[PDB]
């Protein structure tokens, strides 16, 4: 979440979707919103290569409990991350996602 500008727009677009239960959620729909979100923010001016790996994954309730980004990496660069950094980032990304919706709720009440 070090970008901030991109995650702001991404939390405004997933609001109408994640409120529904997880059973009606299918990954094929969220990607469209994700591609639009990059264009709608400053993340469009970015290296096309790294943007090819950034996608969504569905953890396996409510839509605010199974959504998370993945950024899969394979090849030579995969010897620095080694399937454990990707099992640690997602362990972190939840705590930064919760502490981000608990704030945009409290600026909506305000």
């Amino acid at each position: 979440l070090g970008q901030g500008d991109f995650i702001r727009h991404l939390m405004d677009l997933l609001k109408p979707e994640l409120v529904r239960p997880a059973t009606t959620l299918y990954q094929h729909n969220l990607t469209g919103i994700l591609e639009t979100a990059v264009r709608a923010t400053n993340a469009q001016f970015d290296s096309p290569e790294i943007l090819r790996r950034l996608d969504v994954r569905l953890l396996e309730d409510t839509g605010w409990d199974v959504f998370s980004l993945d950024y899969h990496v394979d090849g030579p660069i995969a010897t620095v991350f080694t399937r454990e950094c990707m099992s640690h980032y997602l362990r972190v990304f939840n705590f930064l996602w919760r502490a981000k919706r608990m704030e945009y709720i409290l600026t909506d009440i305000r």
Binding site: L25, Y26, H28, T31, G32
Partner: protein, 116 residues
């Protein structure tokens, strides 16, 4: 927008590399994309839309095989397909929910299937 887009890359990879070895690979990858993008290799979607294909043959014939209202067991035959078509319609909807993003967007411009 898969032909005029993949083709416009195949022609661009040609006028760029003075090497010929690229052409044998650029053209080869161009061909594999068409089989992959156009869902010809993807069996589930290709075995579901195929049912939609021959489905219209029946319906279009039904309207052309007469000039009066659907009374002589045509209506009895009419309600047969809608129970399958609309079932086949929303059946496809769950399939798309990598490449389908360019397709499902067009059908969902008015969020009509969202109500399905």
């Amino acid at each position: 927008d898969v032909l005029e887009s993949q083709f416009s890359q195949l022609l661009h990879q040609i006028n760029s590399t003075r090497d010929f070895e690229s052409i044998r690979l650029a053209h080869d990858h161009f061909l594999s994309n068409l089989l992959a993008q156009s869902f010809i290799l993807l069996k589930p979607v290709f075995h579901c839309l195929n049912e939609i294909l021959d489905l219209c043959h029946s319906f279009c014939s039904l309207v052309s095989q007469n000039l009066g209202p659907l009374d002589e067991r045509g209506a009895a035959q009419l309600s047969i397909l809608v129970k399958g078509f609309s079932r086949q319609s929303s059946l496809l909807f769950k399939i798309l929910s990598n490449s389908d993003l360019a397709q499902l967007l067009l059908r969902l411009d008015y969020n009509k299937y969202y109500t399905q």
